[PDB]
Design a protein around this ligand. Structure first.
Ligand SMILES: Nc1nc2c(ncn2[C@@H]2O[C@H](COP(=O)(O)OP(=O)(O)NP(=O)(O)O)[C@@H](O)[C@H]2O)c(=O)[nH]1
Ligand SMILES: [Mg+2]
Length: 166
């Protein structure tokens, strides 16, 4: 079957794993559990297509920069995740977009900008600023909460559709 190699990237603690585990296993993980590199494979049906989601949940930490070029090369589509109550993680986003474009020799890599933790009241990144950054990249902006599941399927399925239309 058709396989979609998805990679989730972004600063430490923004919710990459909580998003991925919500999509694949339908629960919100509240605990502290830093990732090194996890892979998730799930057979699903998206818009009637039978397909394999091959998802790589990556580390936010700098100390594993050596793994990054390799997974960026293999990935077909990226979720670039920040948290809406962490301005630094938003400010960091362009670093991920820049390294992916360089390693993939492409200025149009399938990608979704994901503003996670939108269930939280104490927002410090306004949606408009994030929507403007996404527009500047020519990619969708989607807000998510791994806690309530708001936007989760949307973010991952939109990324699949970006790959289909690439
Ligand atoms: N309220 C809220 N908290 C969230 C949400 N997403 C993740 N969190 C919380 O934020 C923390 C870090 O989440 P986690 O998924 O481990 O982040 P990560 O980006 O995978 N971290 P790392 O880069 O270390 O692997 C956890 O306490 C998790 O419960 C969200 O949408 N809402
Ligand atoms: Mg993680």
């Amino acid at each position: 079957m058709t396989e979609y190699k998805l990679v989730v990237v972004g600063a430490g603690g923004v919710g990459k794993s909580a998003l991925t585990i919500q999509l694949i296993q339908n629960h919100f993980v509240d605990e502290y559990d830093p990732t090194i590199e996890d892979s998730y494979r799930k057979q699903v049906v998206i818009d009637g297509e039978t397909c394999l989601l091959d998802i790589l949940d990556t580390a936010g930490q700098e100390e594993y920069s050596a793994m990054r070029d390799q997974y960026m090369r293999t990935g077909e589509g990226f979720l670039c995740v920040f948290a809406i109550n962490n301005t630094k993680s938003f400010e960091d986003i362009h670093q991920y977009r820049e390294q992916i474009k360089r390693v993939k020799d492409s200025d149009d890599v399938p990608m979704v900008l994901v503003g996670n933790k939108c269930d939280l009241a104490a927002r410090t990144v306004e949606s408009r600023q994030a929507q403007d950054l996404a527009r500047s990249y020519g990619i969708p902006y989607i807000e998510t909460s791994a806690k309530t599941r708001q936007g989760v399927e949307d973010a991952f399925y939109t990324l699949v559709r970006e790959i289909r239309q690439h």
